[PDB]
Each structure stands twice: as structure tokens, then as C-alpha cells.
Design a protein around this ligand. Structure first.
Ligand SMILES: [K+]
Ligand SMILES: [K+]
Ligand SMILES: [K+]
Ligand SMILES: [K+]
Ligand SMILES: [Mg+2]
Ligand SMILES: [Mg+2]
Ligand SMILES: [Mg+2]
Ligand SMILES: [Mg+2]
Ligand SMILES: [Mg+2]
Ligand SMILES: [Mg+2]
Ligand SMILES: [Mg+2]
Ligand SMILES: [Mg+2]
Ligand SMILES: [Mg+2]
Ligand SMILES: [Mg+2]
Ligand SMILES: [Mg+2]
Ligand SMILES: [Mg+2]
Ligand SMILES: [Mg+2]
Ligand SMILES: [Mg+2]
Ligand SMILES: [Mg+2]
Ligand SMILES: [Mg+2]
Ligand SMILES: [Mg+2]
Ligand SMILES: [Mg+2]
Ligand SMILES: [Mg+2]
Ligand SMILES: [Mg+2]
Ligand SMILES: [Mg+2]
Ligand SMILES: [Mg+2]
Ligand SMILES: [Mg+2]
Ligand SMILES: [Mg+2]
Ligand SMILES: [Mg+2]
Ligand SMILES: [Mg+2]
Ligand SMILES: [Mg+2]
Ligand SMILES: [Mg+2]
Ligand SMILES: [Mg+2]
Ligand SMILES: [Mg+2]
Ligand SMILES: [Mg+2]
Ligand code: NA
Ligand code: NA
Ligand code: NA
Ligand SMILES: [Zn+2]
Lengths: 127, 104, 149, 57, 49, 113
RNA sequence: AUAGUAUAUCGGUAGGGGAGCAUUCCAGCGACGUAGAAGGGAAAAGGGCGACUUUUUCUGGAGUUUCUGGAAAAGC
RNA sequence: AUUGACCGAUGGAGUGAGGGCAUGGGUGCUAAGGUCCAUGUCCGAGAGGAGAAGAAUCCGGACCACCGGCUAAGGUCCCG
RNA sequence: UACCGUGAGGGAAAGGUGAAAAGAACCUCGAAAGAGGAGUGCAAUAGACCCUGAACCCGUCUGCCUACAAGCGGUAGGAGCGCCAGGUGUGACUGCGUGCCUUUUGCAUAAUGAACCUACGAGUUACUGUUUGUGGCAAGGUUAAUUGUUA
């Protein structure tokens, strides 16, 4: 009856001005990933790529490839190669995804549960 | 000038055109007039008239605006711990809105 | 539905906050401090508000001539504890006087003040001097006969 | 031996005040122009302190 | 007239319902007192006892 | 028939949880903690409605005491002189006159002194 | 509660009595819904008192319901 | 004189672990926050005020609201 | 059935895209996992764990407060500041305040009990009596099994 079509049209027009990339269902713990997101929040993209490349945390390699995608989405939606010193990380957040439950034996016949957690990461860039 | 008068068991400061909220008056309609001859003090810019029983000659006339205005709802709670007794009621106080016309 | 005639609270922008200089030349220690505490609290202000600092800043002079009666100078035992085992210690009002008048008056006026954050603030509005000489002439302190209170 | 109570959200977050990823000590390579860790050989060019150290094929 | 049926005044009454909260005045112990034989499920009176 | 009041049962909880907004920690949103805290607060309010009348009369008397003392009279003697002269002005009015209209207060004092 | 507005009375555990609200389904007289039903988020307003009710707006995308009477898998 | 507070018939109960204080006593040691009776009372099932903080000591029996007034026990140098 | 048990035996969990697969050709970043677009469609925040999509629990942003301060965390007052014409968010400072349940003569009790949320969870029905409110008939009241007609 055209109501949801009209709600969705406005949702799409706003998305043309938002430059972002997403990582979904990353098989690592959200709390450790958050330690990396606090490091590059609000930082120039050229400096953040080097910071992520030489970080001692293992979660940084995944995030480095997501920042590259976010920049490329920006250039696709703006129709020009980005300058140097221009973009920066305006927003970043990590959310806990679905958990995989496992079993680890314990003494005297008891069994405990192991959680293998996942997370989502979303990055925004801005000029 | 300003005056102190006992309207409905309450002593208030009254000036021309004030829109006071007083305790509910029975049997009134909007636009009716009401007199209040219980002036205790009169202060007309410098000279003070203190009423021993009353000022004896002063009064105020008001035009009723809203016959019935309800105060905010208050929850009345009673409870005795470890005994099971518990009740909860709601209360609204009833007022009347009046606009002071003359401070005769 | 609302309250027409209401009582007004003084605030930071409406209090008076005068400066006063009093004289301790021959006054009893606890009787003078009972009146100084009223002055700092604002009990003499018609706009007194218990949750705001509305009293007067007080300057006490000639405080080295305060009078204590009885055998109180070396007869009134104070007690305190260091926090270590076997750590209780005793001291007298004369022991404070050796440090200075501002160490006896501050202790006595404290204890006559509210035991809260506000009381901790207003005790700083008290200045106590041994001699007759101070430096507050920029504040224009007023003179008050404490015997008139 | 055992927690008498679960910790509130506030107490847990106050302890985690000092859980920070350490930032690398980075420098620009005077030859390549790339980021490298100070006092190490640039992995891109192979240079170090103005001299070739790891001739990379 | 099946839309406007009415029984005589005082002819029908609601049944008692116990153990459903304090406001009813019938919750908690649910009219049974506190302890003893009479408070238990399955108590019945021994008629001649 | 089978009767389960899912929507009604859940609506009762949601209404009260609007009243517990602003509380510390689990006391604002966890149901059995929040309801416990809200019920205790209602008991305070019944008691504090009564204590309000005590606290405001004590504040009127303190202000009247300071105003009277600036005119050479304590509160107890001023009140004794008013009740002797039949003046029926209440303490709320006098305290307001003491603070905001000091010239009218001085006329009441000059009538009994 | 008594007398027909007046007088009295209104702290309560076990416990006795009175009067109501919501829920599921049924009968009857009737209404609402793709020009947006139920449900979910937000806000405002009502009730001698309360259990609760009503309205507006976002989501949602097909069912819902007033009153009188009737029956319970009828409330944490 | 007394708001009516007493009784009969008949439907429904709960309770049948009490406790403190004062007075008269037994017991104990003229001990016990002890124990067993009697007469009142209060807590139990009773909030408010004084006692710094106390189940039953002193004052006092909460229908709801009020930023009105008079008092009780107890108080009026400051915290109050 | 899976699973557990030597065996007799015990014994689960698990429904829903869309009207129609039209189940996403092709491009961009990536080694490719994942996404951003494009396209299909009323709708893709209907994208395969897919209707709706709550709570506990977890993030980011914005507004106000917070590093001299000490107790069941509220309640009654009360400035300042920020938003939108007197509403709303916050709360400097002040007064008062030892959770709840159950069991007890008496519990802040250092007596019992609960990690939290959502869902589940405990005076019911039959028969035979008895008292009572409401009715029918009335010196009478009432049928039981069963039978006839119709459907
Ligand atoms: K239905
Ligand atoms: K959701
Ligand atoms: K501070
Ligand atoms: K135990
Ligand atoms: Mg993993
Ligand atoms: Mg590494
Ligand atoms: Mg083994
Ligand atoms: Mg650490
Ligand atoms: Mg009962
Ligand atoms: Mg219970
Ligand atoms: Mg029990
Ligand atoms: Mg028993
Ligand atoms: Mg029994
Ligand atoms: Mg059994
Ligand atoms: Mg009463
Ligand atoms: Mg009652
Ligand atoms: Mg049920
Ligand atoms: Mg027995
Ligand atoms: Mg016995
Ligand atoms: Mg005993
Ligand atoms: Mg004895
Ligand atoms: Mg005993
Ligand atoms: Mg009693
Ligand atoms: Mg949607
Ligand atoms: Mg869905
Ligand atoms: Mg300090
Ligand atoms: Mg015991
Ligand atoms: Mg008992
Ligand atoms: Mg106690
Ligand atoms: Mg403890
Ligand atoms: Mg036990
Ligand atoms: Mg436990
Ligand atoms: Mg406990
Ligand atoms: Mg619980
Ligand atoms: Mg539970
Ligand atoms: Na009960
Ligand atoms: Na709509
Ligand atoms: Na439930
Ligand atoms: Zn290099």
C-alpha cells in the first residue's frame, strides 16, 4: 500500500551521503577488538594505516583492511581520488556478535562451557 | 498597593490582576463575583495599616475564572514490612482559579 | 493546581556577605565562639537559607587575650588517635595556644558548625589574629561590638 | 576465596581504566617516505640510517 | 431480546478466589492460618475424632 | 478455553519502569530490584509530606528571629506582643515580610513595641 | 453506618464480610480495518480511589472490537 | 449517664510457642534480659514526638491533602 | 530418532523469506572472508540463522554533573547550565532515611532465601449433604430410567 516504499525511499537518499564499511561475524572476541578501536578513533586515515600496520595486537590486521575499504567507498560515492591529509576516522564501533559454545573437560567428570565469541566492526570516514 | 487577606483559610498577598489558585469554592460558575472582607494588612506604598482583628474597611473583589482545577496526582502508599499489608491510592487536590479585579 | 504564595530561597547571587571585625580582648572562649558560629552561619540574616553560604566573613583580633575559666587551661583533656595500635594521645587548650590562637579558635568553632560539606566551606570564612594588626583594608571590614549580639 | 557479590557495571569499568593498547613508535623513512618503527630497518626499501642494509630482490 | 438479558437482583454472585495477592485479602496463607495439620494439602476431618 | 494475559502482564511492569528512570545501577531497569526501590521510595514520600510542614515553619521562625533582632526584640518576645495585641498574621506572611518588604515588618514591630 | 443533607465513625497480623478491574472464548444487538488491524518504541491525558483506560506519533503489514449476558487452562 | 458498647438462633473462622513493665506472691541467693501464678497495661497486630542511637520507659491511637493555628512529654548558648 | 546404559530400560531439542526465487548479472576495496554499490521486488532495516522483532546484557554519539569526598542509594527541598514558553534533561548544596521475603516473644540482623531477564509454575472438578441470596408452584411440590414426534 506504498507506505513502506515511502519510508524506504528516504532511508536510501540519506545513505548516499554516508561513507562507511562493515565487518560482520569476525571470529574474535569483541573486548580485545575494542582495544584497537579506541586507538584509531578520530585520527587521520594515513596515520592510522601505519599505526594499524605496526600494531602488536593481532586484531589490527583485520581492521587495517576494513579501513582501506571505507576509503574506497568514499571515493566511489564522491567521484575522485582522496587527497593526503584529507580524510579521518570520524566514527568506529565494535559490537558483540553471536557466540559459539564448546565443551572443555574438568576433573572428576565435570564439564565446563567455552565461549568462542565474535564481533562486528563499522567504520565511518569524513573529510 | 498589596494586601494580605484570608481567602479560604489561607493568607495570601493580593494585587490587582493576579490569577490566584485558592481552595475549591462550592456553587460557582465562571464569571461570578466573590468578595473577601478579611484584610489583615494593607500596604499602599509607604503607609502600613495593621488589622488588629481586621483592617475594617478593606476588601477584595474577584472574578471566578475556572470553577474546578485539579492538582497534580499524588500516590498515597501504606506498607508494613514482613506483615503483608499494602495499599496504594491516588489523590488530587481541588482548587478554584480567580482573577483579582479591584483591591478596594 | 500550583502554589501561588511561596517562600523564596536566597542563592549565590542574592546573599549579602559582609565583612566584620570582632574583638576577643576579654571574652570567654566558648561563649564568644558560640556567637561567632551564629555570625558565620547567617543566623542574623532575614534571608537566611540553610543550604547556601549566606553568613558573614569574620575577623577576630586580640585573640591571644581570650579567657578560659576554672582549671581549664591545663585541666581539659583532649583525645585523639594516630591510627596505630597504642596510638591514643592527650593535649590541652594551652598546648594549642602555643601553636597560636588560630589553632584553638578553629578547633572550638568547629564542632559548633554543621557536620557536612557546607560547614567545611564556611569555616574558611574565619580569620583569627593574635595582635591588633591585620591586612584586609581592601575589603573594608566593618566594626561590630560582639557584646551587642 | 569467593566473591561475596557480583561487581556492578561501574566497578568493573573503573578497573578497566588501565587497559590500553600500546601505540607503536613510528618514524618516516628518509628514503622511502614510508612509516617504519624507529630504530629498525625499513621493510619496504631495506635501508637503515642512510645506508642499504637488506638488499631486497 | 438476547442482547439485553438481565437476572434478578441478588440472584448471581461471584465465587471466592484465594491465593491471588494481598489486595484481595485472601492471598499468602490463603485462609488456612500458619501451620499444623489443618494447613496441609489433603487434610480432612476425622468425623468422630 | 486457555487464558494467558501476556500483553497485560508485561504492561504492568513497563509502566512502573518508567517511574524508576534516573536511579543508580540496576535499581533503574532490573525488574525485581527496581520495584523494590520504588516501593521503598513511596514510603519516604508519605513521611516527607508531613515533615515538609515542620521544616517550613522552622524556616519562617528563624527568619523572623533575625528580623526582630535587628529592631531590638527576640522572636519569643515579639510573638508574645503580637498575640497580646490580637494580631493574627501567620508566620509564613511575616517571614516573607521580614525578607522582601522590611518596611512593612517594621510597622508591625512599631505597633506592639 | 444510622436518620433522612445531619450526627457518629474510618491504625491493623491470623481471620470474617462488601464492591470492582484485567485476561481467553461464546450468544445477541452492532462497529473498525491496505485511505493501515493486532503486536513493539515514544509522548500526553484521565480515574470517589485503584486494579486500569483513552488519545497522538514512529514501526508493522492483517486482522480487531463496544455494550448486555454466559463459561474459565482467569493475574507471580 | 452512655454512638449504642449486651444476648439468642444460625453460616464462616483463626488461636490453643507468647513477651515486657507496675503491683501481690511462690521458687531461686530478697541473683538472672530466670522461672511459676494473680490483677492491670502496652508490644504482639501500633506509625508520630522526647530520651544520641533501644519492641513494650514518658507523651500520643495515623481517612487523604495543605509552604495555616494551638498545645503534650520534653525543652529555649551553638551543632538543633 | 539422536543421545545415555552391559542389559532390562531411559529419552530430547528443533515450525514461518517472498504473491511469485524474481534466491542478487555486473562493478569497487580485498589473497579471498566481509562489505559498499548496482539490479529484482510493495518492501532487502523481507538476503537465506530471512514475518514481527521485547527484556536482561553490550556499544557509539550528544546534553548536564563529577578528582577534600564516607553508609539500603531514595525521598522532600533547591541554584546554575542545555534544549523546546513554561514545559523538559541534569543536579551544586540541604533535611530525613539500617533492602525485601519467610519464621518468630522479638530480625539491619552475623536466622532462611534469590546472579539477572523472558517464559513456566501451586484450592480444581465430579458426586452426596447442609446454610444462604434469587425464583416457580403451593396443602402440595417434583420426576428418574425410559418412550413418542421432529430434525
Ligand atoms: K485473537
Ligand atoms: K533489535
Ligand atoms: K570539588
Ligand atoms: K545458619
Ligand atoms: Mg575465535
Ligand atoms: Mg602480531
Ligand atoms: Mg574420567
Ligand atoms: Mg588491568
Ligand atoms: Mg487478613
Ligand atoms: Mg507473601
Ligand atoms: Mg508458611
Ligand atoms: Mg505454631
Ligand atoms: Mg491452625
Ligand atoms: Mg504430599
Ligand atoms: Mg484513627
Ligand atoms: Mg482499616
Ligand atoms: Mg494460570
Ligand atoms: Mg498444645
Ligand atoms: Mg501453651
Ligand atoms: Mg522471662
Ligand atoms: Mg519472681
Ligand atoms: Mg522462657
Ligand atoms: Mg495496642
Ligand atoms: Mg522494519
Ligand atoms: Mg526478522
Ligand atoms: Mg579538609
Ligand atoms: Mg528464637
Ligand atoms: Mg505471631
Ligand atoms: Mg529492629
Ligand atoms: Mg552485612
Ligand atoms: Mg530453617
Ligand atoms: Mg543465598
Ligand atoms: Mg539475608
Ligand atoms: Mg527474587
Ligand atoms: Mg527465580
Ligand atoms: Na494471608
Ligand atoms: Na502508520
Ligand atoms: Na510472568
Ligand atoms: Zn624506507
Amino acid at each position: 500500500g506504498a507506505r513502506k516504499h515511502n519510508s524506504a525511499e528516504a532511508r536510501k537518499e540519506a545513505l548516499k551521503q554516508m561513507y562507511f564499511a562493515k565487518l560482520r561475524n569476525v571470529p574474535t572476541s569483541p573486548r580485545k577488538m575494542r582495544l584497537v578501536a579506541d586507538m584509531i578513533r578520530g585520527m587521520e586515515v594515513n596515520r592510522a594505516l601505519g599505526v594499524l600496520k605496526f600494531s602488536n595486537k593481532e586484531a589490527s590486521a583485520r581492521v587495517e583492511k576494513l579501513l582501506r575499504s571505507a576509503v574506497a567507498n568514499w571515493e566511489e560515492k564522491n567521484e575522485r581520488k582522496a587527497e593526503e591529509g584529507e580524510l579521518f576516522v570520524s566514527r568506529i564501533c565494535v559490537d558483540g556478535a553471536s557466540t559459539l559454545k564448546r565443551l572443555r573437560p574438568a576433573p572428576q567428570g565435570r564439564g565446563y562451557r567455552i565461549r568462542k565469541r565474535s564481533n562486528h566492526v563499522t567504520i565511518y570516514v569524513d573529510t | 498597593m498589596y494586601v494580605i487577606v484570608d481567602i479560604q483559610g489561607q493568607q495570601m498577598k493580593v494585587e490587582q490582576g493576579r490569577r490566584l489558585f485558592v481552595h475549591h469554592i462550592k456553587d460557582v460558575e465562571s464569571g461570578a463575583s466573590v468578595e473577601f472582607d478579611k484584610v489583615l494588612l494593607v500596604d499602599n506604598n509607604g503607609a502600613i495599616t495593621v488589622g488588629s482583628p481586621l483592617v475594617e474597611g478593606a476588601k477584595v473583589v474577584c472574578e471566578v475564572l475556572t470553577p474546578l482545577v485539579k492538582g497534580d496526582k499524588v500516590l498515597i502508599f501504606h506498607k508494613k514490612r514482613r506483615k503483608g499489608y499494602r495499599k496504594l491510592n491516588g489523590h488530587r487536590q481541588q482548587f478554584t482559579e480567580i482573577l483579582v479585579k479591584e483591591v478596594v | 493546581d500550583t502554589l501561588s504564595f511561596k517562600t523564596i530561597s536566597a542563592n549565590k547571587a542574592t546573599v549579602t556577605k559582609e565583612w566584620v571585625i570582632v574583638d576577643a580582648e576579654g571574652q570567654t572562649l566558648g561563649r564568644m565562639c558560640a556567637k561567632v558560629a551564629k555570625l558565620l552561619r547567617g543566623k542574623y540574616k532575614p534571608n537566611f537559607t540553610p543550604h547556601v553560604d549566606c553568613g558573614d566573613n569574620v575577623i577576630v583580633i586580640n585573640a591571644d587575650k581570650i579567657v578560659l575559666s576554672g582549671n581549664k587551661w591545663d585541666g581539659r583533656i583532649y583525645l585523639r588517635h594516630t591510627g596505630y595500635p597504642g596510638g591514643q594521645r592527650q593535649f590541652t587548650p594551652r598546648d594549642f595556644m602555643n601553636k597560636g590562637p588560630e589553632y584553638l579558635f578553629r578547633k572550638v568553632v568547629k564542632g559548633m558548625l554543621p557536620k557536612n560539606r557546607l560547614g567545611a566551606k564556611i569555616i574558611g570564612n574565619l580569620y583569627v589574629y593574635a595582635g591588633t594588626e591585620h591586612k584586609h583594608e581592601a575589603q573594608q571590614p566593618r566594626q561590630l561590638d560582639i557584646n551587642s549580639l | 576465596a569467593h566473591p561475596k557479590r557480583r561487581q556492578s557495571k561501574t566497578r568493573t569499568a573503573k578497573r578497566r581504566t588501565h587497559d590500553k593498547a600500546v601505540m607503536p613508535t613510528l618514524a618516516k623513512c628518509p628514503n622511502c617516505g614510508a612509516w617504519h618503527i624507529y630504530h629498525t630497518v625499513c621493510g619496504d626499501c631495506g635501508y637503515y640510517r642512510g645506508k642499504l642494509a637488506i638488499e631486497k630482490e | 431480546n438476547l442482547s439485553s438479558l438481565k437476572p434478578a437482583e441478588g440472584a448471581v454472585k461471584s465465587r471466592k478466589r484465594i491465593g491471588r495477592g494481598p489486595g484481595s485479602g485472601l492471598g499468602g496463607t490463603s485462609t488456612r492460618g500458619h501451620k499444623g495439620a489443618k494447613s496441609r494439602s489433603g487434610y480432612s476431618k476425622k468425623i468422630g475424632f | 478455553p486457555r487464558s494467558v494475559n501476556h500483553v497485560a502482564s508485561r504492561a504492568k511492569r513497563k509502566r512502573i519502569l518508567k517511574l524508576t528512570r534516573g536511579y543508580f545501577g540496576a535499581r533503574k531497569n532490573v525488574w525485581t530490584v527496581a520495584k523494590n526501590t520504588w516501593e521503598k521510595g513511596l514510603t519516604y514520600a508519605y513521611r516527607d509530606r508531613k515533615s515538609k510542614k515542620r521544616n517550613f515553619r522552622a524556616l519562617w521562625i528563624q527568619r523572623i528571629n533575625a528580623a526582630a533582632r535587628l529592631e531590638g526584640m527576640s522572636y519569643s518576645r515579639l510573638m508574645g506582643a503580637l498575640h497580646a495585641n490580637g494580631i493574627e498574621i501567620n508566620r509564613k506572611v511575616l517571614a516573607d515580610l521580614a525578607m522582601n518588604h522590611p518596611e512593612a515588618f517594621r510597622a508591625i514591630v512599631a505597633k506592639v513595641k
